[PDB]
Amino acid sequence: TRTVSEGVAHIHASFNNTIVTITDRQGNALAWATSGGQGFRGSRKSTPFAAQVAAEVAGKAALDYGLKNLDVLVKGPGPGRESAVRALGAVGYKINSITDVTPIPHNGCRPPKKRRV
Amino acid sequence: MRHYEIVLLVHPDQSDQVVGMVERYISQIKEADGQIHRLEDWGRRQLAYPINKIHKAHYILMNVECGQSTLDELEELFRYNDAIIRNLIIRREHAITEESLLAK
């Protein structure tokens, strides 16, 4: 029902899963989609193809509110951070900027122990 | 007596009151003894990052010479004055009197 013009797309990319959240400015959510929401359960949630599918679903959902231009913020490593932006551009929003916002400690907490696989 | 350089960041709401405080501290240093070697007002400047949800600040530089006790009293005053949000005290050798780059 609500109408906004500008938007932001947060791509939480992770070694296990990618979450796309399309939000208005000042960060109130409008649409969201993940790989598990389209399938690819378990180990397949981390493929760029799954990331692309999630991104297109989220963009098509947000078009109902109706947005022309969005800024893309990517957070985390893992497959699909580029693929999701590809899918958004394919859907047809105009991308104002793409910035990486992965957080870095200045030596904060101690990480978990190393895996002996 | 040792030499010190003081940088004060005062809230923009107290931009008018900054003058009274500066003469207050200068008078205290002079009553102790001391010599004010440099005094500069950089005016109001935009912060590189917000401090206490504030984006502007009034900048003051002082180059003073003082004993130990007066340094402690100045530190206490800076601690308990709410107008000052940040301060930097750096011990220095010699005395500095030249015009700073940032004052312009």
Binding site: - | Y49, I51, R86, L88, L101, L102
Partner: protein, 52 residues
């Protein structure tokens, strides 16, 4: 070098705000240490950002 000379300070800072190593800038070691101290002092005084 003093922390007030932000014009010289920005020359040794990347876009995101990190300190540029002497390996790249060709700076001598003593100058590099003085420069790092000045940059940290300026960051504390909010003359330049910690990040971005």
């Amino acid at each position: 070098i003093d922390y007030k000379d932000i014009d010289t300070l920005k020359q040794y800072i990347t876009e995101n705000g990190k300190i540029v190593p002497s390996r790249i800038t060709g700076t001598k070691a003593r100058y590099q240490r003085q420069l790092a101290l000045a940059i940290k002092q300026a960051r504390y005084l909010s003359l330049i950002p910690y990040t971005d």
